[PDB]
Amino acid sequence: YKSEYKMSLVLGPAFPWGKGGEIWADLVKQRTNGRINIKLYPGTSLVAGDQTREFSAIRQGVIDMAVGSTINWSPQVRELNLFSLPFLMPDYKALDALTQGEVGKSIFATLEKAGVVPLAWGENGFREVSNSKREIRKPEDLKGMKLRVVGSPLYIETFNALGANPTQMSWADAQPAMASGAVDGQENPQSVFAAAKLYTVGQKFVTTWGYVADPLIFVVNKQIWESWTPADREIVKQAAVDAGKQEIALARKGLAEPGAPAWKDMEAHGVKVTHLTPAEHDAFRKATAKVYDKWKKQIGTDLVTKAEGAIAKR
Ligand SMILES: CC(=O)[C@](C)(O)C(=O)O
Ligand SMILES: [Cl-]
Ligand SMILES: [Cl-]
């Protein structure tokens, strides 16, 4: 066995995502008697911050293991766009119906065939839109807004349909762009908004539209996986499962509850948080429906249809 294994993370331990990675690494070390020793590489440094080619680096073996967002791997694995379909998932029960059901199983099978062994699910969360200029209640309010997105083309199309001017860039590159005003806004889970203190870089309006949510996946490179004994593979897998459950709890703190206290915490920092009426929500869904239909065909219409059904029956 290697003396040190490398785990890639976009977000470090200040964030639930990175805490999940840390827990995984600590449990693996503990339960292998110190035999498997994993170092965390936050900021996606193993790919020079270019998170949208992290999957290829994992498949190639530049990265040994990772906790990744489905968004970042979507350019290489089209099925991961399922979680990015605008207004697919109404709530946490809907996301869980996917990850814990046939849809998640189908996605895992696809990943395994691609040379990247999936072991567990975590969560980034529902990605709420923020900006420095004005309240967003309806699609028209986004007209001309310079919103940062990750470099996965579906996000460009979604925001184009809403009349915005989206620009793609890595999480690293988003920071100076928000600080200078080069972009007006961004979209990310509450726990990321909070831990990155995005209100300090102009993000003073938030709308909790819940348009998409990105889960996380715990994965190991196939050859690293096979290099381990079947018994060690079992330890690492169970450690990922344990870490994933803990990490989802961290990612949902103050959020999967009626009065979303976590967003009230942000109000206290001078953030105007807007909650849409059901009618306002339906207008956003209708405005993005053509993008949804287009990408449903691209992803695999049968897989998306299975997701729709799992959500309806949740
Ligand atoms: C998808 C992801 O990696 C982040 C940190 O949420 C982002 O880049 O916005
Ligand atoms: Cl950090
Ligand atoms: Cl829920």
Structural domains for the chain: 1-314 (3.40.190.170)
Q: Is the dihedral of CA 307, 206, 216, 162 positive or negative?
A: positive
The ligand 1 atom at the shortest distance from the C-alpha of residue 15 is 5
Task: List residues near ligand 1 (CB under 6 A).
Answer: 10-11, 51, 69, 71-72, 124, 150, 171, 188, 192, 214
CA of 209 to the centre of ligand 3 (A): 14
Contact, 66 vs 5, CB < 8 A?
A: no
Q: Is 165 annotated as a binding residue?
A: no
Q: Cβ-count burial of 9 within 10 angstroms (0-12 exposed, 13-18 middle, 19+ buried)?
A: buried
Which stretches of the chain are assigned E, i.e. beta strand? 5-8, 38-41, 65-69, 116-126, 128-131, 148-149, 167-168, 185-188, 205-207, 213-221, 272-274
Taking the CA of residue 148 as reference, the ligand 1 atom at the shortest distance is 9
Q: Is there a contact between 192 and 15 (Cβ–Cβ < 8 Å)?
A: yes
Encoding tokens for residue 196? Answer: 């990155």
Parallel, antiparallel or unpaired: strands 205-207 and 148-149: unpaired
CA 75 to chain centre: 14
Dist CA 70 CA 77 (whole Å): 9
d(CA 123, CA 69) in angstroms, rounded, equals 8
Q: Is 148 annotated as a binding residue?
A: yes
Check: CB of residue 5 under 8 Å from CB of residue 224: yes
Neighbours of 259 (CB within 10 A): 8
Q: Residues before each break in the chain (C–N > 2.5 Å)? A: none
Least Cα distance to 132 among 207, 185, 192 occurs for 185
Of 120, 75, 112, 140, the closest CA to residue 283 belongs to 140
Ligand 1 atom with the smallest distance to the CA of 11 is 5
Residue 35 assigned ligand-binding role: no
Annotated resolution, angstroms = 1.3
Q: Give buried/exposed letters for 58-73 (b at 16+ CB in 10 A, else e).
A: bbeeebbbbbbbbbbb
Mutate to test the pocket of ligand 1, among 50, 67, 72 (most ligand atoms within 8 A of CB): 72
